[PDB]
């Protein structure tokens, strides 16, 4: 197969860029305590989530998919798959939180101050983390390193999630698709769409009534739409693949195993590089700290 070389390259590149990006974001947000604003506190939580997603998911997916065997043990299967599902859960709920912050900030600006101080930020972060650790508890319990043997007569293992009833496994993936994609996606569409309506109504009202401020707003609207579109492009493939694997399991596995799911997951982790770019390296008030930090 020619695909391993491009898989290895694009994984290594996204891993390097994600480690550099998220650790730079972390170091800039912890070295500049003046920068630890409420929003930047959520961006730190997101950057940590995305670093954890990179460091756990990318090695222990690329390596097993290149080797077509889970060389690690059942404990590593359980631990990795827990941290994967967790960092997906947290990353999504942090994107939701930033959508709802921006909705308060722009669409209800005067009321917003009453309900987004640092205390609300930390309480919501702790809530999303602890909830995510709770609802991901099925992974370490019911993930198992189910054995097989390849035609080389090698003994081999695959880390797979097999909730006991197949019908409960379908309930589970429908629940995860809903709570961890469709509702997050609806909420981000509602939030960033209302923000975009507010901003464009401002633009059209000024065109009826500064040009640099109109450019700054169209740049914000663009960046928000890029957030929504790249969230759907990152996550609709993985979650559709998992829903297919839940309902028509063998038909999904027969087509997506190996290279297709490897790139679908590469998109899912590309989210972890995209997010710190858009939310940090594109922001002025973060660039002005990166050049100030070490």
């Amino acid at each position: 197969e020619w695909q391993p070389a491009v898989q290895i390259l694009l994984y290594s590149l996204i891993f390097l860029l994600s480690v550099l990006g998220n650790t730079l974001v972390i170091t800039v947000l912890i070295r500049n305590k003046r920068m630890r604003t409420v929003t930047n506190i959520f961006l730190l939580s997101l950057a940590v989530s995305d670093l954890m997603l990179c460091l756990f998911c990318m090695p222990f997916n690329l390596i097993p998919n290149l080797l077509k065997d889970f060389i690690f043990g059942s404990a590593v299967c359980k631990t990795t798959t827990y941290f994967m599902g967790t960092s997906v859960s947290v990353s999504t709920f942090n994107l939701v939180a930033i959508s709802l912050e921006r909705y308060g900030a722009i669409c209800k600006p005067l009321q917003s101050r009453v309900w987004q101080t640092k205390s609300h930020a930390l309480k919501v972060i702790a809530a999303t983390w602890c909830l995510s650790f709770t609802i991901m508890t099925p992974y370490p319990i019911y993930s198992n390193l189910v054995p097989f043997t390849k035609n080389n007569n090698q003994t081999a293992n695959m880390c797979r999630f097999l909730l006991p009833n197949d019908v409960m496994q379908q309930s589970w993936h429908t629940f995860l698709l809903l709570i961890l994609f469709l509702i997050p996606g609806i909420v981000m569409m509602v939030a960033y769409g209302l923000i975009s309506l507010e901003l464009y109504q401002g633009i059209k009202f000024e065109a009826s009534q500064s040009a640099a401020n109109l450019m700054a707003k169209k740049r914000v609207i663009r960046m928000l739409i890029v957030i929504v579109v790249l969230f759907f492009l990152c996550w609709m493939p993985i979650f559709s693949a998992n829903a297919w694997r839940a309902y028509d399991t063998a038909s999904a596995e027969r087509r997506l195993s190996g290279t297709p799911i490897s790139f679908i997951l590469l998109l899912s982790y590309t989210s972890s590089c995209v997010n710190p770019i858009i939310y940090c390296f594109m922001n002025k008030r973060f660039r002005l700290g990166f050049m100030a930090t070490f």
């Binding site: 998911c57 077509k68 798959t81 994967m84 599902g85 997906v88 797979r160 999630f161 190996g258 899912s268």
Partner: peptide, 8 residues
């Protein structure tokens, strides 16, 4: 063989 993928 190796048919499958971890959920995430």
């Amino acid at each position: 063989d190796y048919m499958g993928w971890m959920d995430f």
